[PDB]
Design a protein around this motif. Structure first.
Motif, PDB file in Angstrom:
ATOM      1  N   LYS A  89       0.840  -1.175   0.000  1.00  0.00           N
ATOM      2  CA  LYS A  89       0.000   0.000   0.000  1.00  0.00           C
ATOM      3  C   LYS A  89       0.887   1.240   0.000  1.00  0.00           C
ATOM      4  CE  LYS A  89      -3.893  -2.156   2.312  1.00  0.00           C
ATOM      5  NZ  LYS A  89      -4.872  -2.002   3.412  1.00  0.00           N
ATOM      6  N   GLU A  90       0.297   2.388  -0.277  1.00  0.00           N
ATOM      7  CA  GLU A  90       1.113   3.585  -0.420  1.00  0.00           C
ATOM      8  C   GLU A  90       1.317   4.308   0.911  1.00  0.00           C
ATOM      9  N   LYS A  91       1.351   3.560   2.016  1.00  0.00           N
ATOM     10  CA  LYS A  91       1.336   4.153   3.348  1.00  0.00           C
ATOM     11  C   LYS A  91       2.635   4.892   3.642  1.00  0.00           C
ATOM     12  CE  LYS A  91      -2.769   2.675   4.715  1.00  0.00           C
ATOM     13  NZ  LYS A  91      -2.922   1.625   5.755  1.00  0.00           N
TER      14      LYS A  91
ATOM     15  N   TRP B  46       2.438  10.836  -4.069  1.00  0.00           N
ATOM     16  CA  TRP B  46       1.776  12.128  -4.005  1.00  0.00           C
ATOM     17  C   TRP B  46       2.223  13.084  -5.095  1.00  0.00           C
ATOM     18  CZ3 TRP B  46       3.184  10.338   1.119  1.00  0.00           C
ATOM     19  CH2 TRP B  46       2.094   9.714   1.729  1.00  0.00           C
ATOM     20  N   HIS B  90       1.300   3.416  -9.422  1.00  0.00           N
ATOM     21  CA  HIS B  90       1.502   2.593  -8.224  1.00  0.00           C
ATOM     22  C   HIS B  90       2.271   1.309  -8.518  1.00  0.00           C
ATOM     23  CE1 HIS B  90      -1.137   5.270  -5.993  1.00  0.00           C
ATOM     24  NE2 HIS B  90      -2.017   5.152  -6.972  1.00  0.00           N
ATOM     25  N   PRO B 119       1.905  24.061  -6.921  1.00  0.00           N
ATOM     26  CA  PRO B 119       0.921  24.103  -5.829  1.00  0.00           C
ATOM     27  C   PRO B 119       0.925  22.880  -4.931  1.00  0.00           C
ATOM     28  CG  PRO B 119      -0.049  24.819  -7.893  1.00  0.00           C
ATOM     29  CD  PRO B 119       1.257  24.196  -8.234  1.00  0.00           C
TER      30      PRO B 119
ATOM     31  N   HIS C   6      -4.781  -5.163  -5.692  1.00  0.00           N
ATOM     32  CA  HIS C   6      -5.292  -3.806  -5.523  1.00  0.00           C
ATOM     33  C   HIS C   6      -6.667  -3.649  -6.170  1.00  0.00           C
ATOM     34  CE1 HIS C   6      -0.966  -2.658  -4.849  1.00  0.00           C
ATOM     35  NE2 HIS C   6      -1.545  -1.902  -3.936  1.00  0.00           N
ATOM     36  N   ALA C   7      -7.089  -2.395  -6.309  1.00  0.00           N
ATOM     37  CA  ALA C   7      -8.310  -2.103  -7.043  1.00  0.00           C
ATOM     38  C   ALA C   7      -8.031  -1.636  -8.460  1.00  0.00           C
ATOM     39  CB  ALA C   7      -9.138  -1.048  -6.310  1.00  0.00           C
TER      40      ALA C   7
ATOM     41  N   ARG D   3       2.481  27.140   0.952  1.00  0.00           N
ATOM     42  CA  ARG D   3       2.033  25.944   0.234  1.00  0.00           C
ATOM     43  C   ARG D   3       1.135  25.113   1.143  1.00  0.00           C
ATOM     44  NH1 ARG D   3       7.019  22.798  -2.105  1.00  0.00           N
ATOM     45  NH2 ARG D   3       5.383  21.730  -3.301  1.00  0.00           N
ATOM     46  N   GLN D   8      -4.822  13.842   0.981  1.00  0.00           N
ATOM     47  CA  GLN D   8      -4.166  12.539   1.031  1.00  0.00           C
ATOM     48  C   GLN D   8      -2.829  12.603   1.758  1.00  0.00           C
ATOM     49  OE1 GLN D   8      -3.548  11.179  -2.953  1.00  0.00           O
ATOM     50  NE2 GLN D   8      -2.862  13.170  -3.719  1.00  0.00           N
ATOM     51  N   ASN D  12      -2.692   9.747   4.870  1.00  0.00           N
ATOM     52  CA  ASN D  12      -2.138   8.756   3.950  1.00  0.00           C
ATOM     53  C   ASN D  12      -3.075   7.557   3.920  1.00  0.00           C
ATOM     54  OD1 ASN D  12       0.029  10.537   4.162  1.00  0.00           O
ATOM     55  ND2 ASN D  12       1.132   9.192   5.566  1.00  0.00           N
ATOM     56  N   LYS D  13      -4.161   7.692   3.163  1.00  0.00           N
ATOM     57  CA  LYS D  13      -4.966   6.522   2.851  1.00  0.00           C
ATOM     58  C   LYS D  13      -4.183   5.581   1.952  1.00  0.00           C
ATOM     59  CE  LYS D  13      -8.729   5.975   3.700  1.00  0.00           C
ATOM     60  NZ  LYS D  13      -9.352   5.235   4.816  1.00  0.00           N
ATOM     61  N   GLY D  14      -3.563   6.124   0.928  1.00  0.00           N
ATOM     62  CA  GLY D  14      -2.766   5.323   0.003  1.00  0.00           C
ATOM     63  C   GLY D  14      -3.650   4.519  -0.947  1.00  0.00           C
ATOM     64  N   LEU D  15      -3.629   3.197  -0.792  1.00  0.00           N
ATOM     65  CA  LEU D  15      -4.405   2.290  -1.634  1.00  0.00           C
ATOM     66  C   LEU D  15      -5.182   1.356  -0.709  1.00  0.00           C
ATOM     67  CD1 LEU D  15      -1.725   1.560  -4.378  1.00  0.00           C
ATOM     68  CD2 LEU D  15      -3.639   3.148  -4.478  1.00  0.00           C
ATOM     69  N   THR D  16      -6.331   1.810  -0.254  1.00  0.00           N
ATOM     70  CA  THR D  16      -7.229   1.048   0.596  1.00  0.00           C
ATOM     71  C   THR D  16      -8.359   0.448  -0.232  1.00  0.00           C
ATOM     72  OG1 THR D  16      -8.451   3.079   1.101  1.00  0.00           O
ATOM     73  CG2 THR D  16      -6.746   2.394   2.662  1.00  0.00           C
ATOM     74  N   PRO D  17      -8.930  -0.681   0.194  1.00  0.00           N
ATOM     75  CA  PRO D  17     -10.081  -1.233  -0.527  1.00  0.00           C
ATOM     76  C   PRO D  17     -11.298  -0.336  -0.391  1.00  0.00           C
ATOM     77  CG  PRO D  17      -8.995  -2.938   0.736  1.00  0.00           C
ATOM     78  CD  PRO D  17      -8.400  -1.640   1.179  1.00  0.00           C
ATOM     79  N   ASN D  18     -11.969  -0.105  -1.521  1.00  0.00           N
ATOM     80  CA  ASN D  18     -13.136   0.768  -1.557  1.00  0.00           C
ATOM     81  C   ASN D  18     -14.284   0.144  -0.784  1.00  0.00           C
ATOM     82  OD1 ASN D  18     -12.073   2.870  -3.215  1.00  0.00           O
ATOM     83  ND2 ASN D  18     -12.313   1.523  -4.992  1.00  0.00           N
TER      84      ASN D  18
END
Lengths: 94, 227, 54, 74, 49
Positions: A89-91, B46, B90, B119, C6-7, D3, D8, D12-18
């Motif tokens: 995951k991108e944590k 990001w 990703h 930004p 992943h999704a 800035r 996000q 940091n949600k990142g890639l969580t299951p929907n």
RNA sequence: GAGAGGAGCCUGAGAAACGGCUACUACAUCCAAGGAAGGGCAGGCGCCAAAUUACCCAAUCCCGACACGGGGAGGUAGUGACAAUAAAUACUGAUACAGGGCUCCGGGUCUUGUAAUUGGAAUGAGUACAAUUUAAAUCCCUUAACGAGGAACAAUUGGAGGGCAAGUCUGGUGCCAGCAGCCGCGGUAAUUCCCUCCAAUAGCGUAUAUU
């Protein structure tokens, strides 16, 4: 491997990065130098995407299983302190 | 210690300020050799854009900062490094550019701009340096496409694909394919409709079908480098 | 694993229609329509084979 | 002219299951789960649901089946 | 040097002119006999089954 | 109970007072190299990092020419998912359309849904005037005012399963099958496309020892 629950290790060679099947156990397993024991055991990195994070020479924490190669026994849990699923995951970065 | 250096321009002399620090970075000969560098790009989590291949970048490797252009490419089932056109979201691809050489396992940073007006989150891509070479072997699929002109049972004269019987003869044993998943073989150049030919297929195809040749044209990355 | 997917690794991939020239000619058979005319032809030729043996 | 950090970045949600808006609240999720398993027991067994209503027996609605013996031999 | 950033600036102009400009038929990943020149398939070198 | 260390000494009502003198013993600091001053616990790292270098004698109490002057007892607060406790992330209508929904090879049941269109109320997290509490602040108790329409005020952790390309890889007596697929012709201000079920649920997974 019944005295301690997690063992640290050095990633020695990513065994079978030249395989064809993307999520086969050949591509998933990684050769590991155990630090305190000195032995070399291979362990399952649970994804090819996580295999892209498992790099050479890095400090890598491993654990066991519980239940294509039935017999490879350990499991990569961390790479350089950060957890490997939190890298998947991108944590977190490393 | 003291360090005297000859040959320093009047931009650093006539524009010196003690606010911006000065590095003395230690190269090697490997860090002094140009060439092609194979590189494991992941996009940043990001960074918001996706990274085209031909678009130039600014690199943080070694001691210096590049503006060179990579070629993103997936080592797709480990028989070819097929050239992508964008960085995968990703996922780790294999980028490759022309710059100075560095030893592998050199983790590195990557940028699209040195401007304060961004930004959000100027860092483009992060990774590790995979290896080094000259003369890359990055491969892009070229398809030659064509239309069934006359349809017999297993053979088919197909058209609008090759320009001449010389080209047919160059490809006169080739595996041709119909997007129904129907394989076939280029057999021989049809004589008077120049550029058309005769193929055979594993079954009867339709006029609605479209006939492809999945060849693999090689891609050289561009060199150009500036700090 | 399915939990280790992943999704974006579950996105459906889009089938591509014909060019607007070939839109006159019809539907681009991709694998489904090919299997329909292939199984229908196999069934027809199987029945004709049995009748020729009769 | 500072800035601003985006959302996000902050989380940091990142890639969580929907996941679902019904899964967002556990009390709503067990409410929508009991309504469905109250619904499925209507399909299996026979619920009382009041006697004759206002109109007073318009007949056995939803048919009558004569062969069927829905009973426990004793 | 201004000479170095001048010649490098010219090479930037040439390359970004190529990024603006069109895509060659070998790189547009589906080429046909209408798209390409006449004997231009002959001179190249590919890998096919 | 024993306290840089033996040896002696002095004060006082009470001390063999040592965080007080005199030599000797073991180190060590300032020097203009003759001379001098010198003899604690707490903090961080340690035998890859996680509990403040907090504010007060206001209370209760103690000591001095003594109402003032002094207090390393004590009090007030800060961190804390190790626990333990309460419980948010919504509640309620109306119409329109659809005809199936569900359950065990053929059975059994009768109202169910909608990424359908609209209408209502409810606000508590929070933002926060004030005043108060207090040594001073804060928490609390009051508290005027703002404070909800999903693209948000943006619930998680595990598992099971389905679908997919002009993509890829492998096997083989065409058209099959396998493993799998963020990777496809173009395109990145380019695109607006696919999910279901189970469990616990502000908590949950994993490894070994295991009972």
């Amino acid at each position: 491997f019944g005295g301690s629950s997690h063992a640290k290790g050095i990633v020695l060679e990513k065994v079978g990065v030249e395989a064809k099947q993307p999520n086969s156990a050949i591509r998933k397993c990684v050769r590991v130098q155990l630090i305190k024991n000195g032995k070399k055991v291979t362990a399952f990195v649970p994804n090819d995407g996580c295999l892209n994070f498992v790099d050479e020479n890095d400090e890598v924490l491993l654990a066991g299983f519980g239940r294509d190669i039935p017999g490879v026994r350990f499991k990569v849990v961390k790479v350089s302190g950060v957890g490997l699923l939190a890298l998947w995951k991108e944590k977190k970065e490393k | 210690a003291r360090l005297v250096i000859e040959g320093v321009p009047a931009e650093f002399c006539k524009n010196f300020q003690p606010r911006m620090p000065i590095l003395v970075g230690g190269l090697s000969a490997t860090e002094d050799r140009f060439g092609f560098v194979q590189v494991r790009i992941k996009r940043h989590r990001w960074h918001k854009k996706i990274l085209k291949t031909g678009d130039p970048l600014i690199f943080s490797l070694g001691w210096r900062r590049f503006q060179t252009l990579p070629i993103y490419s997936i080592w797709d089932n480990r028989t070819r490094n097929r050239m992508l056109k964008y960085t995968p979201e990703h996922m780790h691809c294999f980028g490759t550019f022309w710059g100075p050489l560095i030893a592998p396992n050199t983790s590195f940073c990557c940028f699209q701009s040195f401007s304060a007006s961004n930004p959000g989150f100027r860092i483009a891509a992060t990774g590790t340096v995979l290896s080094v070479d000259e003369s890359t072997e990055i491969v892009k699929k070229l398809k030659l496409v064509g239309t069934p002109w006359k349809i017999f049972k297993n053979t088919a004269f197909i058209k609008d694909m090759f320009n001449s019987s010389l080209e047919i003869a160059k490809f006169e044993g080739a595996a041709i394919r119909t997007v129904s998943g129907i394989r076939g073989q280029i057999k021989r150049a049809l004589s008077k409709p120049e550029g058309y030919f005769r193929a055979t297929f594993e079954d009867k195809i339709l006029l609605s079908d479209i006939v492809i040749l999945k060849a693999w044209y090689p891609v050289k990355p561009k060199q150009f480098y500036n700090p | 694993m399915s939990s280790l997917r992943h999704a974006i690794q579950r996105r459906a991939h889009k089938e591509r229609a014909q060019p607007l020239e070939r839109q006159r000619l019809g539907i681009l058979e991709k694998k489904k329509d090919y299997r329909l005319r292939a199984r229908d032809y196999k069934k027809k030729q199987a029945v004709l084979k049995s009748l020729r043996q009769k | 002219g500072k800035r601003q950090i985006t959302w996000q970045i902050q989380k940091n949600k990142g890639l969580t299951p929907n996941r679902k808006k019904e899964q967002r609240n556990p009390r709503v999720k067990k409410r929508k789960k009991y309504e469905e398993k109250q619904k499925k027991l209507r399909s299996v067994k026979a619920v009382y649901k009041g006697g004759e209503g206002p109109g007073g027996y318009q007949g056995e609605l939803s048919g009558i089946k004569t062969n069927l013996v829905k009973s426990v031999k004793l | 040097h201004e000479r170095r950033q001048a010649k490098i600036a010219e090479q930037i102009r040439k390359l970004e002119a190529e990024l603006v400009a069109k895509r060659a038929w070998t790189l547009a990943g589906e080429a046909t006999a209408a798209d390409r020149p006449v004997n231009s398939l002959l001179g190249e070198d590919m890998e096919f089954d």
